[PDB]
Amino acid sequence: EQIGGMRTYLDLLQHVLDHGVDRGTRSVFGYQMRFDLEEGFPVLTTKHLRSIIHELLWFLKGDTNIAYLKENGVTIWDEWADENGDLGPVYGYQWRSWPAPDGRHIDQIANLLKMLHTNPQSRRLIVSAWNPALVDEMALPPCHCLFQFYVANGRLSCQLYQRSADIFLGVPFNIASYALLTMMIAQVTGLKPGEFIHTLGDAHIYSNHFEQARLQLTRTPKKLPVMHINPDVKDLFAFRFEDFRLDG
Amino acid sequence: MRTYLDLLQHVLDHGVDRDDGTRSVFGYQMRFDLEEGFPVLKLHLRSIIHELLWFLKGDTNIAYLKENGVTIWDEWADENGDLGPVYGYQWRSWPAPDGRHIDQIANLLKMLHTNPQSRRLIVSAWNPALVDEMALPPCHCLFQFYVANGRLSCQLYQRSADIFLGVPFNIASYALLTMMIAQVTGLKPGEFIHTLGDAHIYSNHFEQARLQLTRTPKKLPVMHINPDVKDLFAFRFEDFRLDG
Protein backbone atom coordinates (compact mmCIF):
# COMPACT_ATOMS: atom_id res chain seq x y z
CA GLU A 1 0.00 0.00 0.00
CA GLN A 2 2.00 2.95 -1.36
CA ILE A 3 0.56 6.07 0.29
CA GLY A 4 1.89 9.65 0.16
CA GLY A 5 2.19 12.82 -1.91
CA MET A 6 3.76 11.21 -4.96
CA ARG A 7 1.06 8.52 -5.02
CA THR A 8 -1.72 11.10 -4.74
CA TYR A 9 -0.19 12.94 -7.70
CA LEU A 10 0.41 9.65 -9.50
CA ASP A 11 -3.26 8.83 -8.88
CA LEU A 12 -4.22 12.05 -10.69
CA LEU A 13 -1.83 11.22 -13.52
CA GLN A 14 -3.42 7.78 -13.79
CA HIS A 15 -7.03 8.91 -13.50
CA VAL A 16 -6.71 11.37 -16.35
CA LEU A 17 -5.01 8.77 -18.65
CA ASP A 18 -7.75 6.19 -17.98
CA HIS A 19 -10.82 8.40 -17.90
CA GLY A 20 -9.72 11.61 -19.54
CA VAL A 21 -11.45 12.79 -22.67
CA ASP A 22 -9.20 14.07 -25.46
CA ARG A 23 -10.05 17.35 -27.19
CA GLY A 24 -4.53 16.15 -27.09
CA THR A 25 -5.22 17.31 -24.38
CA ARG A 26 -6.80 14.49 -22.42
CA SER A 27 -8.91 15.88 -19.55
CA VAL A 28 -11.32 15.56 -16.66
CA PHE A 29 -13.29 18.34 -14.98
CA GLY A 30 -13.11 18.48 -11.21
CA TYR A 31 -10.43 16.78 -9.14
CA GLN A 32 -9.19 17.13 -5.59
CA MET A 33 -5.95 16.08 -3.92
CA ARG A 34 -4.83 16.36 -0.32
CA PHE A 35 -1.23 16.66 0.83
CA ASP A 36 -0.19 16.40 4.46
CA LEU A 37 2.54 19.05 4.62
CA GLU A 38 3.79 17.45 7.85
CA GLU A 39 4.85 14.39 5.83
CA GLY A 40 7.38 16.38 3.85
CA PHE A 41 7.58 18.89 1.05
CA PRO A 42 5.50 17.69 -1.92
CA VAL A 43 8.20 17.45 -4.63
CA LEU A 44 6.30 15.49 -7.26
CA THR A 45 8.79 15.73 -10.12
CA THR A 46 10.67 12.70 -11.40
CA LYS A 47 13.31 15.37 -12.13
CA HIS A 48 13.55 24.22 -10.49
CA LEU A 49 13.07 25.11 -6.81
CA ARG A 50 14.85 28.40 -7.46
CA SER A 51 12.04 29.42 -9.82
CA ILE A 52 9.40 28.32 -7.27
CA ILE A 53 10.73 30.27 -4.29
CA HIS A 54 11.68 33.45 -6.19
CA GLU A 55 8.38 33.43 -8.06
CA LEU A 56 6.55 33.18 -4.74
CA LEU A 57 8.59 35.99 -3.14
CA TRP A 58 7.95 37.95 -6.33
CA PHE A 59 4.18 37.35 -5.93
CA LEU A 60 4.27 38.46 -2.30
CA LYS A 61 6.08 41.73 -3.12
CA GLY A 62 3.18 42.65 -5.47
CA ASP A 63 5.63 43.12 -8.35
CA THR A 64 4.30 42.45 -11.85
CA ASN A 65 7.59 43.44 -13.47
CA ILE A 66 9.77 40.53 -14.64
CA ALA A 67 13.00 42.34 -13.54
CA TYR A 68 13.38 40.79 -10.05
CA LEU A 69 12.88 37.36 -11.68
CA LYS A 70 15.43 38.03 -14.47
CA GLU A 71 17.82 39.38 -11.80
CA ASN A 72 17.66 35.98 -10.06
CA GLY A 73 17.75 33.99 -13.34
CA VAL A 74 14.03 33.08 -13.40
CA THR A 75 12.68 32.98 -16.95
CA ILE A 76 9.22 31.38 -16.54
CA TRP A 77 7.42 34.72 -17.07
CA ASP A 78 9.66 36.05 -19.89
CA GLU A 79 7.42 35.00 -22.81
CA TRP A 80 4.52 37.19 -21.56
CA ALA A 81 6.51 40.30 -20.64
CA ASP A 82 5.97 43.43 -22.74
CA GLU A 83 8.77 45.74 -23.97
CA ASN A 84 9.26 47.15 -20.44
CA GLY A 85 9.12 43.75 -18.73
CA ASP A 86 5.58 44.32 -17.48
CA LEU A 87 3.08 41.45 -17.34
CA GLY A 88 -0.09 43.34 -16.53
CA PRO A 89 -2.31 42.53 -13.53
CA VAL A 90 -0.93 39.07 -12.68
CA TYR A 91 -0.79 37.33 -9.24
CA GLY A 92 1.33 39.84 -7.29
CA TYR A 93 -0.92 42.74 -8.28
CA GLN A 94 -4.12 40.84 -7.53
CA TRP A 95 -2.77 39.60 -4.20
CA ARG A 96 -1.34 42.85 -2.84
CA SER A 97 -3.21 45.54 -4.84
CA TRP A 98 -6.59 44.22 -5.94
CA PRO A 99 -7.99 47.32 -7.69
CA ALA A 100 -11.28 48.58 -6.28
CA PRO A 101 -13.46 50.90 -8.47
CA ASP A 102 -12.82 53.91 -6.20
CA GLY A 103 -9.06 53.62 -6.76
CA ARG A 104 -8.35 51.88 -3.46
CA HIS A 105 -6.20 48.78 -3.48
CA ILE A 106 -7.07 45.73 -1.41
CA ASP A 107 -4.06 44.03 0.13
CA GLN A 108 -5.63 40.55 0.32
CA ILE A 109 -2.46 39.04 1.78
CA ALA A 110 -2.24 41.55 4.64
CA ASN A 111 -6.00 41.14 5.18
CA LEU A 112 -5.61 37.35 5.33
CA LEU A 113 -2.81 37.69 7.94
CA LYS A 114 -4.85 40.04 10.13
CA MET A 115 -7.85 37.73 9.83
CA LEU A 116 -5.73 34.68 10.72
CA HIS A 117 -4.63 36.41 13.93
CA THR A 118 -8.03 37.77 15.00
CA ASN A 119 -10.42 35.16 13.63
CA PRO A 120 -8.60 31.91 12.62
CA GLN A 121 -11.93 30.03 12.55
CA SER A 122 -13.15 32.45 9.86
CA ARG A 123 -14.74 30.84 6.80
CA ARG A 124 -13.55 33.58 4.49
CA LEU A 125 -9.77 33.38 4.80
CA ILE A 126 -9.58 33.89 1.04
CA VAL A 127 -7.33 35.36 -1.59
CA SER A 128 -8.63 35.60 -5.14
CA ALA A 129 -6.68 36.31 -8.30
CA TRP A 130 -9.80 36.05 -10.44
CA ASN A 131 -11.00 39.51 -11.42
CA PRO A 132 -13.73 39.52 -14.12
CA ALA A 133 -12.91 43.16 -14.83
CA LEU A 134 -9.36 42.37 -15.93
CA VAL A 135 -9.26 38.80 -17.29
CA ASP A 136 -10.55 39.69 -20.79
CA GLU A 137 -7.53 41.99 -21.25
CA MET A 138 -4.92 39.49 -20.05
CA ALA A 139 -3.18 37.22 -22.55
CA LEU A 140 -2.83 34.78 -19.64
CA PRO A 141 -5.72 34.93 -17.13
CA PRO A 142 -4.72 33.47 -13.71
CA CYS A 143 -4.97 29.68 -13.52
CA HIS A 144 -4.86 29.81 -9.73
CA CYS A 145 -8.18 31.56 -9.25
CA LEU A 146 -8.69 31.49 -5.54
CA PHE A 147 -7.36 29.92 -2.39
CA GLN A 148 -8.76 29.66 1.14
CA PHE A 149 -7.25 28.83 4.51
CA TYR A 150 -8.50 26.96 7.54
CA VAL A 151 -7.20 26.49 11.06
CA ALA A 152 -7.85 23.46 13.22
CA ASN A 153 -5.78 21.84 15.98
CA GLY A 154 -3.01 24.47 15.58
CA ARG A 155 -2.60 23.52 11.92
CA LEU A 156 -3.08 25.80 8.92
CA SER A 157 -4.58 24.21 5.81
CA CYS A 158 -4.89 25.74 2.34
CA GLN A 159 -7.19 24.88 -0.52
CA LEU A 160 -6.42 26.12 -4.03
CA TYR A 161 -9.00 26.29 -6.78
CA GLN A 162 -7.15 25.96 -10.07
CA ARG A 163 -9.33 26.38 -13.17
CA SER A 164 -6.79 24.90 -15.57
CA ALA A 165 -4.05 22.44 -14.74
CA ASP A 166 -1.54 20.68 -16.97
CA ILE A 167 -1.16 17.69 -14.73
CA PHE A 168 2.17 16.60 -16.24
CA LEU A 169 4.14 19.84 -16.73
CA GLY A 170 2.33 22.31 -14.44
CA VAL A 171 0.70 20.64 -11.41
CA PRO A 172 3.91 19.58 -9.56
CA PHE A 173 5.11 23.20 -9.66
CA ASN A 174 1.69 24.48 -8.67
CA ILE A 175 1.69 22.13 -5.67
CA ALA A 176 5.20 23.01 -4.53
CA SER A 177 4.42 26.72 -4.68
CA TYR A 178 1.18 26.75 -2.61
CA ALA A 179 2.57 24.18 -0.17
CA LEU A 180 5.53 26.51 0.35
CA LEU A 181 3.22 29.52 0.70
CA THR A 182 1.09 27.63 3.21
CA MET A 183 4.23 26.77 5.19
CA MET A 184 5.40 30.40 5.16
CA ILE A 185 2.02 31.66 6.29
CA ALA A 186 1.75 28.95 8.98
CA GLN A 187 5.11 30.05 10.37
CA VAL A 188 4.32 33.76 10.57
CA THR A 189 0.98 33.05 12.21
CA GLY A 190 2.43 30.66 14.85
CA LEU A 191 0.69 27.65 13.36
CA LYS A 192 2.01 24.29 12.14
CA PRO A 193 1.54 23.19 8.54
CA GLY A 194 -1.74 21.38 7.94
CA GLU A 195 -2.89 20.15 4.53
CA PHE A 196 -2.70 21.54 1.07
CA ILE A 197 -5.85 20.68 -0.81
CA HIS A 198 -5.51 21.01 -4.55
CA THR A 199 -8.76 21.40 -6.40
CA LEU A 200 -8.68 21.33 -10.21
CA GLY A 201 -11.09 22.50 -12.85
CA ASP A 202 -9.92 21.40 -16.29
CA ALA A 203 -7.23 18.86 -15.35
CA HIS A 204 -5.49 17.86 -18.55
CA ILE A 205 -2.55 16.17 -20.17
CA TYR A 206 -1.39 16.85 -23.75
CA SER A 207 -1.12 13.91 -26.18
CA ASN A 208 2.67 14.27 -26.54
CA HIS A 209 2.94 13.30 -22.85
CA PHE A 210 0.57 10.30 -22.85
CA GLU A 211 3.42 7.80 -22.91
CA GLN A 212 5.81 9.62 -20.58
CA ALA A 213 3.07 10.01 -17.92
CA ARG A 214 3.28 6.20 -17.70
CA LEU A 215 7.06 6.27 -16.96
CA GLN A 216 5.96 7.96 -13.76
CA LEU A 217 3.10 5.55 -12.97
CA THR A 218 5.52 2.66 -12.28
CA ARG A 219 8.27 4.72 -10.62
CA THR A 220 9.09 3.93 -6.98
CA PRO A 221 8.15 6.92 -4.78
CA LYS A 222 11.07 8.45 -2.94
CA LYS A 223 10.89 9.80 0.61
CA LEU A 224 9.75 13.43 0.60
CA PRO A 225 12.51 15.89 1.47
CA VAL A 226 11.87 18.36 4.32
CA MET A 227 11.54 22.04 3.53
CA HIS A 228 13.41 23.91 6.24
CA ILE A 229 12.30 27.46 6.75
CA ASN A 230 14.21 30.06 8.79
CA PRO A 231 12.04 30.03 11.95
CA ASP A 232 12.90 33.64 12.89
CA VAL A 233 10.92 35.26 10.05
CA LYS A 234 7.59 36.60 11.39
CA ASP A 235 6.85 38.94 8.48
CA LEU A 236 5.51 37.12 5.42
CA PHE A 237 6.71 39.96 3.21
CA ALA A 238 10.26 39.78 4.61
CA PHE A 239 11.21 36.30 3.42
CA ARG A 240 14.38 35.91 1.38
CA PHE A 241 15.58 33.08 -0.87
CA GLU A 242 18.23 32.10 1.70
CA ASP A 243 15.47 31.47 4.27
CA PHE A 244 14.68 28.16 2.61
CA ARG A 245 16.57 24.89 2.47
CA LEU A 246 15.26 21.67 0.88
CA ASP A 247 16.96 18.32 1.61
CA GLY A 248 19.05 17.39 -1.47
CA MET B 1 -27.33 10.93 -3.28
CA ARG B 2 -25.00 8.31 -1.76
CA THR B 3 -22.35 10.90 -2.52
CA TYR B 4 -24.14 13.38 -0.28
CA LEU B 5 -24.64 10.86 2.56
CA ASP B 6 -20.93 10.01 2.30
CA LEU B 7 -20.30 13.70 2.94
CA LEU B 8 -22.40 13.67 6.15
CA GLN B 9 -20.75 10.46 7.25
CA HIS B 10 -17.20 11.69 6.56
CA VAL B 11 -17.65 14.95 8.45
CA LEU B 12 -19.51 13.28 11.34
CA ASP B 13 -16.78 10.63 11.71
CA HIS B 14 -13.66 12.59 10.81
CA GLY B 15 -14.51 16.26 11.24
CA VAL B 16 -12.99 18.41 13.97
CA ASP B 17 -15.13 20.03 16.65
CA ARG B 18 -14.71 23.75 16.98
CA ASP B 19 -16.89 26.09 19.02
CA ASP B 20 -17.96 29.47 17.57
CA GLY B 21 -20.40 24.39 17.80
CA THR B 22 -19.70 22.68 14.47
CA ARG B 23 -17.86 19.59 13.34
CA SER B 24 -15.91 20.30 10.16
CA VAL B 25 -13.53 19.19 7.51
CA PHE B 26 -11.73 21.46 5.07
CA GLY B 27 -11.86 20.53 1.41
CA TYR B 28 -14.36 18.08 0.02
CA GLN B 29 -15.62 17.29 -3.45
CA MET B 30 -18.78 15.60 -4.69
CA ARG B 31 -19.81 14.74 -8.25
CA PHE B 32 -23.42 14.44 -9.45
CA ASP B 33 -24.19 13.14 -12.90
CA LEU B 34 -27.19 15.30 -13.89
CA GLU B 35 -28.36 12.78 -16.50
CA GLU B 36 -29.11 10.34 -13.66
CA GLY B 37 -31.84 12.67 -12.36
CA PHE B 38 -32.05 15.87 -10.39
CA PRO B 39 -29.75 15.60 -7.36
CA VAL B 40 -32.30 16.23 -4.61
CA LEU B 41 -30.81 14.61 -1.63
CA LYS B 42 -38.57 16.29 1.37
CA LEU B 43 -37.03 19.63 0.39
CA HIS B 44 -38.86 22.63 -1.02
CA LEU B 45 -37.52 23.56 -4.43
CA ARG B 46 -39.72 26.59 -5.08
CA SER B 47 -37.41 28.91 -3.12
CA ILE B 48 -34.38 27.49 -4.95
CA ILE B 49 -36.07 28.10 -8.29
CA HIS B 50 -37.34 31.61 -7.52
CA GLU B 51 -34.01 32.59 -5.97
CA LEU B 52 -32.06 31.36 -9.02
CA LEU B 53 -34.38 33.16 -11.46
CA TRP B 54 -33.93 36.19 -9.25
CA PHE B 55 -30.11 35.84 -9.37
CA LEU B 56 -30.41 35.64 -13.17
CA LYS B 57 -32.28 38.99 -13.34
CA GLY B 58 -29.37 40.80 -11.65
CA ASP B 59 -31.49 43.01 -9.40
CA THR B 60 -30.48 43.41 -5.73
CA ASN B 61 -34.02 44.38 -4.70
CA ILE B 62 -35.92 41.65 -2.90
CA ALA B 63 -39.25 42.63 -4.58
CA TYR B 64 -39.46 39.57 -6.89
CA LEU B 65 -38.89 37.27 -3.90
CA LYS B 66 -41.41 39.08 -1.65
CA GLU B 67 -43.95 38.94 -4.49
CA ASN B 68 -43.38 35.18 -4.72
CA GLY B 69 -43.43 34.42 -0.99
CA VAL B 70 -39.73 33.59 -0.83
CA THR B 71 -38.17 34.69 2.47
CA ILE B 72 -34.56 33.50 2.15
CA TRP B 73 -33.21 37.05 1.97
CA ASP B 74 -35.67 38.98 4.20
CA GLU B 75 -33.42 39.37 7.27
CA TRP B 76 -30.76 41.10 5.11
CA ALA B 77 -33.00 43.52 3.20
CA ASP B 78 -33.27 47.17 4.18
CA GLU B 79 -36.50 49.21 4.53
CA ASN B 80 -36.54 49.63 0.73
CA GLY B 81 -35.99 45.90 0.12
CA ASP B 82 -32.46 46.49 -1.15
CA LEU B 83 -29.67 44.10 -0.29
CA GLY B 84 -25.95 44.70 -0.76
CA PRO B 85 -23.97 43.48 -3.79
CA VAL B 86 -25.42 39.97 -3.67
CA TYR B 87 -25.12 37.21 -6.32
CA GLY B 88 -27.42 38.69 -8.99
CA TYR B 89 -25.46 41.94 -8.90
CA GLN B 90 -22.03 40.28 -9.08
CA TRP B 91 -23.16 37.84 -11.77
CA ARG B 92 -24.83 40.40 -14.10
CA SER B 93 -23.14 43.66 -13.05
CA TRP B 94 -19.67 43.01 -11.68
CA PRO B 95 -18.34 46.54 -10.93
CA ALA B 96 -15.15 47.04 -12.94
CA PRO B 97 -12.37 49.37 -11.68
CA ASP B 98 -12.95 51.71 -14.67
CA GLY B 99 -16.68 51.98 -13.79
CA ARG B 100 -18.08 49.53 -16.33
CA HIS B 101 -20.17 46.57 -15.25
CA ILE B 102 -19.32 43.06 -16.33
CA ASP B 103 -22.22 40.79 -17.21
CA GLN B 104 -20.43 37.54 -16.38
CA ILE B 105 -23.50 35.52 -17.28
CA ALA B 106 -23.93 37.10 -20.74
CA ASN B 107 -20.17 36.66 -21.31
CA LEU B 108 -20.44 33.02 -20.18
CA LEU B 109 -23.22 32.29 -22.70
CA LYS B 110 -21.20 34.04 -25.44
CA MET B 111 -18.09 32.00 -24.61
CA LEU B 112 -20.00 28.71 -24.52
CA HIS B 113 -21.15 29.32 -28.10
CA THR B 114 -17.84 30.69 -29.40
CA ASN B 115 -15.30 28.63 -27.45
CA PRO B 116 -16.94 25.59 -25.73
CA GLN B 117 -13.45 24.19 -25.01
CA SER B 118 -12.53 27.26 -22.92
CA ARG B 119 -10.73 26.80 -19.62
CA ARG B 120 -12.06 30.06 -18.24
CA LEU B 121 -15.81 29.60 -18.40
CA ILE B 122 -15.95 31.25 -15.00
CA VAL B 123 -18.47 33.26 -12.99
CA SER B 124 -17.19 34.75 -9.75
CA ALA B 125 -19.10 36.23 -6.85
CA TRP B 126 -15.98 36.78 -4.77
CA ASN B 127 -14.99 40.46 -4.83
CA PRO B 128 -12.27 41.46 -2.34
CA ALA B 129 -13.26 45.11 -2.97
CA LEU B 130 -16.75 44.35 -1.64
CA VAL B 131 -16.65 41.41 0.78
CA ASP B 132 -15.43 43.26 3.90
CA GLU B 133 -18.45 45.62 3.83
CA MET B 134 -21.04 42.93 3.05
CA ALA B 135 -23.26 41.64 5.88
CA LEU B 136 -23.22 38.27 4.09
CA PRO B 137 -20.13 37.66 1.95
CA PRO B 138 -21.06 35.15 -0.78
CA CYS B 139 -20.58 31.52 0.27
CA HIS B 140 -20.62 30.49 -3.41
CA CYS B 141 -17.39 32.05 -4.44
CA LEU B 142 -16.86 30.97 -7.98
CA PHE B 143 -18.08 28.44 -10.47
CA GLN B 144 -16.66 27.07 -13.65
CA PHE B 145 -18.21 25.42 -16.63
CA TYR B 146 -16.77 22.78 -18.92
CA VAL B 147 -17.82 21.22 -22.16
CA ALA B 148 -16.89 17.75 -23.31
CA ASN B 149 -18.71 15.35 -25.65
CA GLY B 150 -21.69 17.68 -25.99
CA ARG B 151 -22.15 17.90 -22.21
CA LEU B 152 -22.04 20.91 -19.91
CA SER B 153 -20.45 20.42 -16.50
CA CYS B 154 -20.22 22.97 -13.69
CA GLN B 155 -17.93 23.11 -10.73
CA LEU B 156 -18.77 25.29 -7.77
CA TYR B 157 -16.22 26.44 -5.20
CA GLN B 158 -18.15 26.93 -1.95
CA ARG B 159 -16.05 28.43 0.86
CA SER B 160 -18.46 27.59 3.65
CA ALA B 161 -20.96 24.84 3.63
CA ASP B 162 -23.49 23.79 6.19
CA ILE B 163 -23.58 20.18 4.97
CA PHE B 164 -26.91 19.47 6.66
CA LEU B 165 -29.11 22.56 6.15
CA GLY B 166 -27.38 24.27 3.26
CA VAL B 167 -25.63 21.84 0.89
CA PRO B 168 -28.75 20.06 -0.42
CA PHE B 169 -30.15 23.45 -1.51
CA ASN B 170 -26.81 24.60 -2.91
CA ILE B 171 -26.59 21.41 -4.99
CA ALA B 172 -30.15 21.86 -6.32
CA SER B 173 -29.55 25.49 -7.26
CA TYR B 174 -26.35 24.91 -9.28
CA ALA B 175 -27.56 21.61 -10.76
CA LEU B 176 -30.61 23.50 -11.99
CA LEU B 177 -28.50 26.35 -13.33
CA THR B 178 -26.31 23.92 -15.23
CA MET B 179 -29.35 22.31 -16.80
CA MET B 180 -30.82 25.71 -17.75
CA ILE B 181 -27.56 26.83 -19.30
CA ALA B 182 -27.08 23.50 -21.13
CA GLN B 183 -30.56 23.76 -22.59
CA VAL B 184 -30.08 27.23 -23.99
CA THR B 185 -26.60 26.48 -25.34
CA GLY B 186 -27.63 23.30 -27.21
CA LEU B 187 -25.79 20.98 -24.79
CA LYS B 188 -26.77 18.01 -22.62
CA PRO B 189 -26.35 18.20 -18.83
CA GLY B 190 -23.03 16.80 -17.67
CA GLU B 191 -21.94 16.68 -14.08
CA PHE B 192 -22.20 19.14 -11.26
CA ILE B 193 -19.04 19.12 -9.15
CA HIS B 194 -19.40 20.64 -5.70
CA THR B 195 -16.18 21.65 -3.98
CA LEU B 196 -16.38 22.69 -0.35
CA GLY B 197 -13.96 24.70 1.80
CA ASP B 198 -15.15 24.64 5.42
CA ALA B 199 -17.67 21.81 5.28
CA HIS B 200 -19.44 21.80 8.62
CA ILE B 201 -22.34 20.38 10.58
CA TYR B 202 -23.74 22.02 13.72
CA SER B 203 -23.93 19.83 16.80
CA ASN B 204 -27.71 20.27 17.00
CA HIS B 205 -27.87 18.41 13.71
CA PHE B 206 -25.49 15.49 14.46
CA GLU B 207 -28.22 12.97 15.23
CA GLN B 208 -30.60 13.98 12.43
CA ALA B 209 -27.66 13.61 10.02
CA ARG B 210 -26.82 10.19 11.53
CA LEU B 211 -30.46 9.17 11.00
CA GLN B 212 -30.31 10.31 7.37
CA LEU B 213 -27.45 7.87 6.77
CA THR B 214 -29.97 5.03 7.36
CA ARG B 215 -32.60 6.13 4.84
CA THR B 216 -32.72 3.81 1.84
CA PRO B 217 -31.81 5.96 -1.18
CA LYS B 218 -34.54 6.27 -3.80
CA LYS B 219 -34.41 6.83 -7.57
CA LEU B 220 -33.74 10.52 -8.25
CA PRO B 221 -36.60 12.61 -9.56
CA VAL B 222 -36.35 14.11 -13.06
CA MET B 223 -36.37 17.87 -13.41
CA HIS B 224 -38.46 18.73 -16.47
CA ILE B 225 -37.66 22.06 -18.06
CA ASN B 226 -39.88 23.82 -20.59
CA PRO B 227 -38.05 22.85 -23.81
CA ASP B 228 -39.35 25.94 -25.62
CA VAL B 229 -37.11 28.30 -23.65
CA LYS B 230 -34.09 29.34 -25.68
CA ASP B 231 -32.93 32.35 -23.64
CA LEU B 232 -31.48 31.86 -20.12
CA PHE B 233 -33.13 35.08 -18.97
CA ALA B 234 -36.60 34.04 -20.24
CA PHE B 235 -37.01 31.18 -17.75
CA ARG B 236 -39.96 31.57 -15.40
CA PHE B 237 -40.99 29.62 -12.34
CA GLU B 238 -43.71 27.77 -14.29
CA ASP B 239 -41.08 26.34 -16.68
CA PHE B 240 -39.85 23.82 -14.08
CA ARG B 241 -41.51 20.65 -12.87
CA LEU B 242 -39.89 18.07 -10.65
CA ASP B 243 -41.54 14.65 -11.18
CA GLY B 244 -41.00 10.98 -10.23
UniProtKB/Swiss-Prot annotation, chain B:
Name the pathway: Pyrimidine metabolism; dTTP biosynthesis
Known catalytic reactions? dUMP + (6R)-5,10-methylene-5,6,7,8-tetrahydrofolate = 7,8-dihydrofolate + dTMP
List positions binding dUMP: R119, R120, R159, S160, A161, D162, N170, H200, I201, Y202
EC no. given is 2.1.1.45
Q: Where is the active site?
A: C139
Gene Ontology molecular function terms on file: thymidylate synthase activity
- Localization of this protein: Cytoplasm
**Chief localization class?**
cytoplasm
Q: Where does (6R)-5,10-methylene-5,6,7,8-tetrahydrofolate bind?
A: H44, D162
Quaternary structure? Homodimer.
HAMAP family in alphabetical order? Thymidy_synth_bact
The text of the family note is:
Belongs to the thymidylate synthase family. Bacterial-type ThyA subfamily.
Could you tell me what this protein is called? Thymidylate synthase
